[PDB]
Design a binder for these strands. Structure first.
Ligand SMILES: [Mg+2]
Ligand SMILES: [Mg+2]
Length: 206
DNA sequence: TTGGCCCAGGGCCCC
């Protein structure tokens, strides 16, 4: 009933990014939050550690106005508190490598909504900053849109949360911290409901 | 417990 036995040794980490566009290679990463997970004694999954950073646009990054219109971020504001892609990701990777070790996992896997998006941005930022020993799987993800489709019959984040019996706020939507937390709680509830229904462990049904 | 965008009104929701 250990975390390391749940996902074949993958350590699931919830990620949401806010960006200045849809292209991971050309558009600025502006914000990232990460939430690691843990299992209790009863084997229920739940949020553990929470990290959140404002990110300084990389050298030569594009900034799409419509993106900034959508997320309401201003990369010029000297008050936002931005750090380098190197800084935010170094911190995230350190906390993650520590969680992998403590739980006896061997690799992290990104949990995110329409996960290829956040995965592509984090990987692009890691490559730019030349971070070595990136603990995240280089192509596998746990997409909560697909998981919600299965569990809840909904793929839109806000709707999936509401369908799962969670609160989800519009006026708080479109900020990394809130997004990541709701996503983490959605993922945990999906995993936990599968367990409550006797789908896990694989021996439980019989 | 989406308001606003994008291809008048409908449907979309990873920025
Ligand atoms: Mg968001
Ligand atoms: Mg997102």
């Amino acid at each position: 009933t250990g975390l390391c036995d749940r996902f074949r040794g993958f350590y699931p980490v919830v990620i949401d990014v806010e960006t200045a566009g849809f292209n991971a290679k050309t558009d600025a990463l502006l914000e990232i939050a990460a939430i690691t997970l843990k299992m209790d004694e009863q084997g229920w999954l739940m949020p553990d550690t929470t990290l959140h950073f404002h990110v300084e646009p990389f050298v030569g990054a594009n900034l799409q106005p419509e993106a900034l219109a959508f997320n309401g971020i201003d990369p010029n504001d000297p008050d936002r508190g931005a750090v380098s892609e190197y800084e935010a990701l170094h911190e995230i990777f350190k906390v993650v490598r520590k969680g992998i070790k403590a739980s006896g996992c061997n690799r992290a896997i990104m949990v995110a909504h329409n996960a290829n998006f956040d995965h592509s941005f984090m990987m692009a930022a890691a490559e730019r900053a030349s971070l070595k020993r990136n603990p995240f799987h280089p192509f596998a993800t746990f997409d909560t849109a697909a998981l919600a489709g299965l569990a809840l019959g909904q793929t839109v984040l806000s709707k999936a949360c509401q369908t799962a019996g969670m609160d989800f706020d519009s006026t708080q939507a479109h900020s990394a911290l809130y997004d990541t937390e709701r996503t983490a709680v959605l993922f945990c509830e999906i995993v936990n409901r599968w367990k409550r229904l006797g789908g896990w462990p694989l021996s439980a049904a019989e």
